[PDB]
């Protein structure tokens, strides 16, 4: 029941320092012989290891990062942290914290692959400002119906930076949901839609609500989608 | 640094096929090679460690083998929920290094899209903007053409498309096309038509509506 | 307590021995492996070298050990410790404290050529390698 | 000398089933110095396990070894078709080095009686002074089969040889060829040449016969 | 990549000697031993001998003591095993395996094997006799036919049917060794009884050791 949970802002300006924290629960860092590391994944590309820290505070860095990475550990909070200095647009990426082993050549060391991962946090490097989304319904109608099936959804428009999360009925409705990749509009603001197909017969009896969260803006919107009788 | 050469970059296969992904290291990593499966929107998940041991709970159709410096990941019979990007990683020494990744594509039978259209909401019109959404649901293959006509005038430069990753159950795609106009432009026209071409359709289809009728 | 220059992979400290290097193998998961490395460097030795393993010991240490290699350790890597250190007067000792198995040897005098050897502690699905390097004078 | 006894000599199962092979030593094997080998026809043995329980490099997870003292076990958790082979155990704790007699792991199917065909010698061979009579047992299971030659209802002995194919990869059956070689003078002396076949698929021993010249 | 490559197949007369070679690569030859295992046709594995390239110590199974000797050439990383006074039960495949440096052990680094065949026979092409389909070789709606490949030496022969066009239902059997020292083999195929009067069937027998190629037509009756 070890769990890793990243935290930290989603937006950083170029030349600034990116800061993230990983909170460990279900076990103690100070009692562990493992190492606590960071791995990143720029959008649409592979995985790169940034570095790790032991519970003593000893650190180990990827030399290809040219000393831009600093890692710290706080055993009294069961946390460890990442600082990446002077970021550029190339540092926009998904950042993971993970538990893993050390390096062959160390005297007494656990050799292990990253097994427990955080969920990943997206950090966007840009000079643009945060903007919360507008949530609009995609109401079901005869023009979104086929057989005993009706499609509905929500349009999540004009937000920055990524990401937003969309659930339906607070997670109770998951089957048939399609939450599309966001598209960068001409305005520099993102837009996406999340749709779901449900039984047509349920449209008068079951309420359908999209739950939209944009953490960079601290916005939470619940939009009930009203069916149309036409 | 130890470099990991993973092959192939992309892999296309049908359900029930045997697939093999290889990884070669630039020097001895002993057997400290891991295989990860990354499904969409998820962190990479550890499948195999020490080149050939399965992580707890991994299906038996997954197996790994080695040959000194050449490592293999084999799925003995592909299933639809195997869709993911697979990565090898040496954990022998720092810095950790990963393979380039193998993106697994599932081949399946043709499936026509369900085509639905959504007029802009009244609330959006109040804010001064009109977005029209065309939905293509659960089709295969990915290639699909979606055009917009407004009062029989073909549109250009005012629509954007986005497509989902292959579904983990039926391996289909879905697509959404959004036509965006100002409120003023929207209210000067009546017919809003989404034009859809797909291999699964015997003829290109129109899904349309008249502004304000519903 | 006798001082053992070597690796203690068990959860309990012995009432008889103290080990220089320790990693509780019960603290790591099945996907983990332990590497424990000991380096002796003296003109002449008078040292107890050994291992404390809560599982199976591979090979028959310290009568036999593995000669290290850039390949995965295999039956043909088994050697006699006598031949590996190349001194004739090696005393071997074994002990047991619960499910902990203790294997030791005593090395006295100088070593003609720097040598290394490995012994494995396998506990169920997990393995811990103990590698000892012993220097010649210089 | 440490005698290793593997029982049984043949195991029969289908893909997906669990395999358990046994190796018993006449005395305890020192320090679990026991190895398991796999061998397929025409190939060198392949190391699967050493130290009783250490999986060799590049061997898939589904193979595991266990045991100590005089009793050791090789387990295949879910057998795959490529696993049908002969398996040898081996001890290297005491000289001389010894091997077990082997266990054949074989594909199991429903009992199939052999199709029995008999061929009299050819006219071209008889001109040379020898007569070879051939009897064919085709596509049967299991492999255990007995062939008897009867010349004028006189059981033959010491003048026939037989050979068996490896198990067919498609239908898991075997076939057997048995040649009876006589002088030509001895062949003209007699009339009825009979091939008597006993097999589990046959309720009664079956005889296929011909009359010389008919 | 540890690798042992063995010398080619040998045919030897009874009483003669044979020298088998095993060439190593991918590791330090002088840090290990070489272990020899033999497998008689259709039999199990038998430990034979061991040599330490490091020290020159040897060990032989009691059956082969004095009759078998070993030596190496370290500059070419080749280990040799010499067998004197070959008899007919020395016919077997001989494997070299990377061995322990200090005592007889073997592992998973095997050579591909060297077959030694002890025979008083000399090279001879086969005679190909038909196994003609008759009423005595029908089992319902199918018929069996074949070719008897008799009295050849040494192995192998290869058999195809209709120049490779006929593969389904073909069983080419392992050869048997007659008392004469010559091999003989059967190749059969099952085909529809419907095709006997209409389809032609030819076995293509190739004995490359004697450069014998025989195409034999097998007709009914
Ligand atoms: C913890 O830090 C010390 C330095 O104070 C270092 O010598 C030691 O190796 C570290 N422990 C590890 C790497 O397990």
Q: CATH number for the domain including B78?
A: 2.60.40.10
Q: Experimentally, how was this structure solved?
A: X-ray
Helix (H, G, I), strand (E, B) or coil at B112: coil
Scanning the structure block, which residue is given the tokens 């619960």? C98
Report the domain count for chain D: 2
Domain finish residue from D107, D130, D164: D107
Class of domain E3-118: mainly beta
Domain finish residue from B49, B75, B107: B107
CA B44, CA B126: separation in Å to the nearest integer?
43
ω into E87 cis (within 30 of 0) = no
* C56 with D56: Cβ contact below 8 A: no
* Inter-CA distances, B8 with A4, B105, D49, D58, Å: 32, 12, 31, 20
E19 Cβ neighbours under 8 A, 6+ residues apart: E80, E81, E82
* Inter-CA distances, D103 with B27, C75, D38, D70, Å: 38, 22, 10, 17
Q: Which domain holds residue D170?
A: 115-211
Q: What CATH fold (topology level) applies to the domain A3-125?
A: Immunoglobulin-like (2.60.40)
Among protein residues, the one whose CA lies closest to atom 7 of ligand 1: A58
Ligand 1, residues at Cβ distance < 6 Å? A 54, 56, 58
Structure tokens at D154: 């006189």
Distance C65 CA to ligand 1 centre (A): 29
CA C58, CA C119: separation in Å to the nearest integer?
6
Scanning the structure block, which residue is given the tokens 């007889």? E104
Please indicate, yes or no, whether residues D120 and D98 belong to a single structural domain of this protein. Answer: no
Please indicate, yes or no, whether residues D85 and D32 belong to a single structural domain of this protein. Answer: yes
* B117 closest CA partner among B193, B187, B191, B190: B193
Please indicate, yes or no, whether residues B12 and B64 belong to a single structural domain of this protein. Answer: yes
ω into C56 cis (within 30 of 0) = no
Please indicate, yes or no, whether residues B126 and B68 belong to a single structural domain of this protein. Answer: no
Count of CA atoms in the C-beta half-sphere (13 A) of D189 = 8
Distance C72 CA to ligand 1 centre (A): 28
Resolution in Å, one decimal, please. 2.2
Please indicate, yes or no, whether residues D9 and D102 belong to a single structural domain of this protein. Answer: yes
The DSSP letter of residue A131 is B
Please indicate, yes or no, whether residues B86 and B125 belong to a single structural domain of this protein. Answer: no
Q: What CATH fold (topology level) applies to the domain A134-224?
A: Immunoglobulin-like (2.60.40)
Domain finish residue from D107, D131, D166: D107
Q: Say if CB B115 and CB B135 are below 8 A apart.
A: yes
CA C118, CA C32: separation in Å to the nearest integer?
18
Q: Say if CB B167 and CB B176 are below 8 A apart.
A: no
Q: Say if CB D142 and CB D121 are below 8 A apart.
A: no
- Per-position DSSP letters for D103-153, written without gaps between them: EEEEE----BPPEEEEEPPPHHHHTTTEEEEEEEEEEEBSS--EEEEEETT
Helix (H, G, I), strand (E, B) or coil at B125: helix
Structure tokens at B50: 């020490």
- Count how many residues are written for chain E: 221
In the stretch 86-105 of chain D, residues with CB closer than 8 A to chain E read 88, 90, 92, 95-102
Domain positions in chain C are: 1-138
Q: Would you tell me which CATH number, out of the four given (3.30.750.80, 2.60.40.10, 3.30.70.100, 3.40.50.720), belongs to the domain E127-218?
A: 2.60.40.10
* Inter-CA distances, D168 with A199, D81, D140, Å: 52, 12, 10
Q: Say if CB A186 and CB A115 are below 8 A apart.
A: no
Please indicate, yes or no, whether residues D122 and D174 belong to a single structural domain of this protein. Answer: yes
Structure tokens at E142: 């199918």
Rounded-to-5 percentages of helix, strand, coil across chain B: 5, 50, 45
Chain D partners (3+ C-beta pairs within 8 A): B, C, E
Q: Say if CB E27 and CB E133 are below 8 A apart.
A: no
Chain C residue with the nearest C-alpha to that of B48: C31
Please indicate, yes or no, whether residues D202 and D169 belong to a single structural domain of this protein. Answer: yes
D74 Cβ neighbours under 8 A, 6+ residues apart: D19, D20, D21, D23, D36, D48, D49, D63, D64, D65, D87, D89
Distance D207 CA to ligand 1 centre (A): 83
Domain positions in chain E are: 3-118, 127-218
What is the edge-to-edge ordering of all strands in the sheet holding A48-53?
A11-12, A121-125, A93-100, A35-41, A48-53, A59-61
User: Cβ of C46 under 8 Å from any chain B Cβ?
Assistant: no
């Amino acid at each position: 029941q070890l769990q890793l949970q990243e935290s930290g802002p989603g937006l950083v300006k170029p030349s600034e320092t990116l800061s993230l924290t990983c909170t460990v629960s279900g076990g103690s860092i100070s009692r562990s012989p493992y190492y606590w590391g960071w791995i990143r994944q720029p959008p649409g590309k592979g995985l790169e290891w940034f570095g790790s820290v032991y519970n003593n505070g000893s650190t180990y860095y990827n030399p290809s990062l040219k000393s831009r990475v600093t890692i710290s550990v706080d055993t009294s909070k069961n946390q460890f942290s990442l600082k990446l200095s002077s970021v550029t647009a190339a540092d926009t990426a998904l950042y993971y914290c993970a538990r893993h082993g050390g390096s062959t050549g160390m005297k007494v060391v656990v050799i292990a692959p990253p097994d427990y991962w955080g969920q990943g946090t997206l950090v966007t490097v840009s000079s643009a400002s945060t903007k919360g989304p507008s949530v609009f319904p995609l109401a079901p109608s005869s023009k979104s119906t086929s057989g005993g099936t009706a499609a509905l959804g929500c349009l999540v428009k004009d937000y920055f930076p990524e990401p937003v999360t969309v659930s339906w009925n607070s997670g109770a409705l998951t089957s048939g949901v399609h939450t599309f990749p966001a598209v960068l509009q001409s305005s520099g603001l993102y837009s996406l839609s999340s749709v779901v197909t449900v039984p047509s017969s349920s449209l008068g009896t079951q309420t359908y609500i999209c739950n939209v969260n944009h953490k960079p803006s601290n916005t939470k919107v619940d939009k009930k989608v009203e069916p149309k009788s036409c | 640094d130890i470099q990991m050469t993973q092959s192939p970059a992309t892999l296309s296969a049908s359900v029930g096929d045997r697939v093999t992904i290889t990884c070669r290291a630039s020097q001895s990593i002993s057997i400290w090679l891991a295989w990860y499966q990354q499904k969409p929107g998820e962190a990479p998940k550890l499948l195999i460690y020490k080149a050939s041991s399965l992580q707890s709970g991994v299906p038996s159709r997954f197996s790994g083998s080695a040959s000194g410096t050449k490592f293999s990941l084999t799925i003995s019979s592909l299933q639809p929920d195997d869709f993911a990007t697979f990565y090898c990683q040496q954990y022998h020494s720092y810095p950790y290094t990963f393979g380039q990744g193998t993106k697994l594509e599932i081949k399946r039978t043709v499936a026509a899209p369900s085509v639905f259209i959504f007029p802009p909401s009244d609330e959006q019109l109040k804010s001064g903007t009109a977005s029209v959404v065309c939905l293509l649901n659960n089709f295969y293959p990915r290639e699909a053409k979606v055009q917009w006509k407004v009062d029989n005038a073909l549109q250009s430069g005012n629509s954007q498309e986005s497509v989902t990753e292959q579904d983990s159950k039926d391996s289909t795609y879905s697509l959404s096309s959004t036509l965006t106009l100002s409120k003023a432009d929207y209210e000067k026209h009546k017919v809003y038509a989404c034009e859809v071409t797909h291999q699964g359709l015997s003829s290109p289809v129109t899904k349309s509506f008249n502004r304000g009728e519903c | 307590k006798k001082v053992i220059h070597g690796c203690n992979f068990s959860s309990n400290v012995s009432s008889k021995y103290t080990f220089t290097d320790s990693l509780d193998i019960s603290l790591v998961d099945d996907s983990a492996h332990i590497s424990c490395n000991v380096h002796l460097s003296e003109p002449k030795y008078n040292h107890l070298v050994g291992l404390n393993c809560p599982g199976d010991i591979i090979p028959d240490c310290f009568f036999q050990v593995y000669q290290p290699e850039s390949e995965e350790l295999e039956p043909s890597n088994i050697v006699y410790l006598d031949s590996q250190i190349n001194i004739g007067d090696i005393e071997y000792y074994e002990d047991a404290e619960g499910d902990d198995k203790i294997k030791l040897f005593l090395i006295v005098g100088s070593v003609p050529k720097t040598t290394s050897f490995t012994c494995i502690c396998k506990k169920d699905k997990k393995s811990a390698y103990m590698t000892v390097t012993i220097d010649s004078a210089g």
